[PDB]
Amino acid sequence: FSKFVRKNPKSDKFKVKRFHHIEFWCGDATNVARRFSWGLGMRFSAKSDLSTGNMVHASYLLTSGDLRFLFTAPYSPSPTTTASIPSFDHGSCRSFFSSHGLGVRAVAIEVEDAESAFSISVANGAIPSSPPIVLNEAVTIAEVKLYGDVVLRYVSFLPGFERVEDPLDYGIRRLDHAVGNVPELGPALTYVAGFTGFHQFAEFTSGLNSAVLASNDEMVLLPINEPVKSQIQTYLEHNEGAGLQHLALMSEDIFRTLREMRKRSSIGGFDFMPSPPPTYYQNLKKRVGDVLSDDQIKECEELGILVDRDDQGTLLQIFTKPLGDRPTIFIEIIQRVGCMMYQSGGCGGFGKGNFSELFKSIEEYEKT
């Protein structure tokens, strides 16, 4: 008596593969990358600083599976020849951090040819941010504006980077989707999907309007939020315009990651949102009992994990507190169940039907 029909026109104007990395623009990349490495459990993989000859910026790379988190901070200007990332600008980086604080600068995706995906994007309305530049005849990097001061980066770690050698792993394996807030969803949705050809990923159905753009294989998901009390309007005010709201980090085992990330919340890691009331986890039997066992439900309660369902699969998720000083960007840890055939992207939705379940649990909790 219910069926959800999802369509996929596969209208990608250029060949998009997978997410490549995320580049946080910092004021001091060392302390940001070392805190992220201890909280998320990511390994110090590569570096491009003074110890590698880079006299322009200190970029450090953290990895946990297919996830790459880059942390870039500008050196004192006292010619960016030794710079490994040619799109980096000292004036831009200082202005970005003074206007937005700690946050994501680049959302990088791997493409077949960055030079073509750049020209096709601009030919379809994309604002150019960095022209196609070939790195040592091996890698090509191009950047166009996504929203606000965040850029969409095309890659087809990097030259100039040196590997770091000499266990830090909590279960995070890849980046699922990067969500950004904009003042008006409409113009931002037609703009981004207007130069990538990304189709809308429908969700099965609070102060927000969300729409999910996705590539053909739907592994590159880009939800965008708009404020309708609203958490988004507070984000726009504190971030001084449109920016990335949160990053969803796929975990091989969300229970492993959550126990690893909660032991360290008070000793350098990350803090989480208030856990759902107990009646929320007394209602999981009549919701995902056929997916999660009774003991795995006890794990979600002890770890404060949100569990939502969809037409295809089940989504286990939780959110952290803001990563920096500003109540702006935070991190989402998810684990998707089902759609195995390789797992389909967006399996289980994103959590649209979770505000209704939290409202129902809070109204239930009370009165008891």
Place this chain on the structure above:
Amino acid sequence: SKFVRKNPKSDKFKVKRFHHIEFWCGDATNVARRFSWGLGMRFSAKSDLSTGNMVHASYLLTSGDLRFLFTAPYSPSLSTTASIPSFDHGSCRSFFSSHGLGVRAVAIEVEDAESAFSISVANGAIPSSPPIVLNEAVTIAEVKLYGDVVLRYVSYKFLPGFERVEDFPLDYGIRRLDHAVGNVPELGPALTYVAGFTGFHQFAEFSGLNSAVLASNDEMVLLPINEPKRKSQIQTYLEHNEGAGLQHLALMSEDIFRTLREMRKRSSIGGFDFMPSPPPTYYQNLKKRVGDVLSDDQIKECEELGILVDRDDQGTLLQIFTKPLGDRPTIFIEIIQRVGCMMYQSGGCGGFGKGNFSELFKSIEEY
């Protein structure tokens, strides 16, 4: 044969001890949460949006009597609510844009800050912030020290506007700040300047740099200053810091082996890294110059943890240095434990490590 140390006790105002150190950051949350894990300091007070402050976010880390403050500016679009009246968004942004992560204020507790500020300015000090009484309880004044670092005065002893943080806690053994060392291009002018308005006397000592230690009457507030074989790290400091600034802080510890076992264990998982260890010959000779102080097992612990041991006419100093704290090879941290001079412990017991360069060079050529 005999070393003679003199103390004129010429403090132009009553000074007690170090109060706190305020780092100016780009993001105070990630820097403090990194410092809290590497050094083992407790989240004690906060002055951010959760307290009503829409101007900046200040977080205090404590370890015994040591207090590290971490201040980062909010966006001016939030528009009075600042608990630290000397804070300026443009100054904090321009400071960090010029020097990066570093020390802004070296706060010392005095008897009266309205006097410490006026007497200082009347004796050559460059004023940074006039005396401001906070909620009729705390008075804060600031005068320039060297570079963009300010010497902050705290009168009646975290601060009004801060909320205590509750919630076993972290503690690696660090208990107090020993001395705050700064690098300047010319030691001479900066010496007659700082001592010109403080009256701090020169602390006598028992490389590429020249050092001079200014100290208060009881010699608990120590402020060594450095000036620029191979090229000295002082000149490399001035280039990457864009002028004079604080070089390092010496964090005294009840047990340097406890603190180092905690700090080295976490160097690769978010903590702080240390300088390369001395060769084994340095610790084979560590029982001929310091054997009446350290036992055989305690000498073995220094070799395992890479600690340097120096000695002077009064006491013995066990010390070790960390790698630079941020992206720039500028600010770093020293862990110190002093033995001897017990009569309460005298300030500067064992010196500051001026003789370690000679014993290290003697140890490298022995290996």
